[PDB]
Design an enzyme around this catalytic site. Structure first.
Site, PDB file in Angstrom:
ATOM      1  N   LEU A   1      -8.454  -6.464  11.389  1.00 12.65           N
ATOM      2  CA  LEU A   1      -8.875  -6.110  10.050  1.00 12.65           C
ATOM      3  C   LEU A   1      -8.687  -7.363   9.047  1.00 12.65           C
ATOM      4  CD1 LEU A   1      -8.474  -2.933  10.825  1.00 12.65           C
ATOM      5  CD2 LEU A   1      -7.198  -2.930   8.790  1.00 12.65           C
TER       6      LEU A   1
ATOM      7  N   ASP B   1      -9.606   2.317   2.359  1.00 13.79           N
ATOM      8  CA  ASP B   1      -9.520   1.846   3.746  1.00 13.79           C
ATOM      9  C   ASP B   1     -10.334   2.840   4.767  1.00 13.79           C
ATOM     10  OD1 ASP B   1      -8.396  -0.626   2.867  1.00 13.79           O
ATOM     11  OD2 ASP B   1      -6.442   0.035   3.539  1.00 13.79           O
TER      12      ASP B   1
ATOM     13  N   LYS C   1       0.617  -1.256   0.004  1.00  9.72           N
ATOM     14  CA  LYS C   1      -0.133   0.124  -0.067  1.00  9.72           C
ATOM     15  C   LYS C   1       0.832   1.240   0.064  1.00  9.72           C
ATOM     16  CE  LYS C   1      -3.943  -2.039   1.996  1.00  9.72           C
ATOM     17  NZ  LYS C   1      -4.638  -2.325   3.004  1.00  9.72           N
TER      18      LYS C   1
ATOM     19  N   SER D   1       0.122  -7.810  10.961  1.00  6.17           N
ATOM     20  CA  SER D   1      -0.106  -9.181   9.876  1.00  6.17           C
ATOM     21  C   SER D   1       0.052 -10.374  10.644  1.00  6.17           C
ATOM     22  CB  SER D   1       0.901  -9.041   8.890  1.00  6.17           C
ATOM     23  OG  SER D   1       2.293  -9.139   9.203  1.00  6.17           O
TER      24      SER D   1
END
Length: 261
Positions: free
Chosen positions: A206, A105, A69, A179
């Site tokens: 998320l 987002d 991103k 992550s």
């Protein structure tokens, strides 16, 4: 109907449910669009360059997911919208032969919320940047927990509070933007995380569509808990609005996307 190709750039990419919901929208709206879009997952090697690949593949538009991103931001020809305050792009659109970056987002996450006054974000990637930009704009107090001094500069110009050590404080929204779920682990030591969940209004991950360790702990403690599936649909809907050059509003792609998923 003339064709336009789209994709989503990701590493990994296989989990994404974007192709499904964008393609349902392309099939439903071709008549209004007056062109058929087709949408494909793209596993992009780290050493690849997003604009080259976008150009080389002849796409009319793309989504971007981890870990690309912040990099997508650097290689747009223009940046438009709230993405300018995110230093991150999840949405690309070819406009007059410029590569244009949007960030959906931020808005996607915000619409996904079912009265929170403050927020702990875990992690520092492109997702955390957009979410901190978003929740600041809306007047929540935001702290960020990271492992490193990477991307602190940015959160600090936003006026977040930054930490490497977990702060001794209650938070309404604990947000996992690391992550860690992808790797199937917690983002924080279990006890520290237990402290926050007992005093918190919502644990939010998320990652979508399995009970992550972060979510599972919250669930064990009886903390309200939400994954990213709602955020997925809103941000995709807003992404499709841009792919349609704003002919189809996001509320209409939303309806088609929620329903299919």
């Amino acid at each position: 109907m003339k064709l336009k190709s789209f994709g989503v750039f990701g590493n990994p990419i296989k989990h994404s449910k974007s192709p499904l919901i964008h393609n349902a929208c392309f099939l439903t709206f071709q008549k209004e669009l007056r062109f058929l879009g087709h949408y494909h997952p793209i596993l992009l090697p780290l050493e690849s360059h997003i604009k080259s690949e976008f150009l080389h593949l002849g796409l009319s538009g793309a989504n971007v997911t981890l870990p690309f991103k912040e990099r997508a931001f650097q290689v747009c020809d223009k940046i438009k919208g709230i993405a300018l305050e995110c230093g991150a792009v999840n949405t690309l659109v070819l406009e007059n032969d410029e590569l244009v970056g949007y960030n959906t987002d931020a808005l996607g996450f915000y619409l996904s919320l079912k009265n929170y006054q403050n927020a702990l974000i875990l992690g520092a990637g492109g997702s955390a940047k957009a979410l901190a930009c978003e929740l600041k704009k809306q007047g929540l107090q935001v702290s960020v927990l990271n492992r490193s001094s990477r991307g602190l500069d940015f959160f600090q110009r936003l006026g977040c509070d930054c930490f490497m050590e977990p702060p001794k404080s209650a938070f309404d929204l604990i947000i996992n933007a690391t992550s860690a779920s992808l790797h199937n682990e917690l983002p924080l030591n279990k006890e520290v995380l237990k402290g926050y969940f007992k005093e918190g209004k919502l644990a939010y991950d998320l990652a979508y569509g399995f009970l992550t360790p972060f979510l599972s702990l919250a669930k064990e403690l009886k903390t309200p808990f939400q994954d990213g599936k709602d955020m997925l649909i809103y941000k995709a809907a807003l992404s499709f609005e841009k792919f349609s050059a704003s002919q189809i509003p996001y509320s209409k792609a939303f309806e088609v996307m929620r329903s299919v998923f």
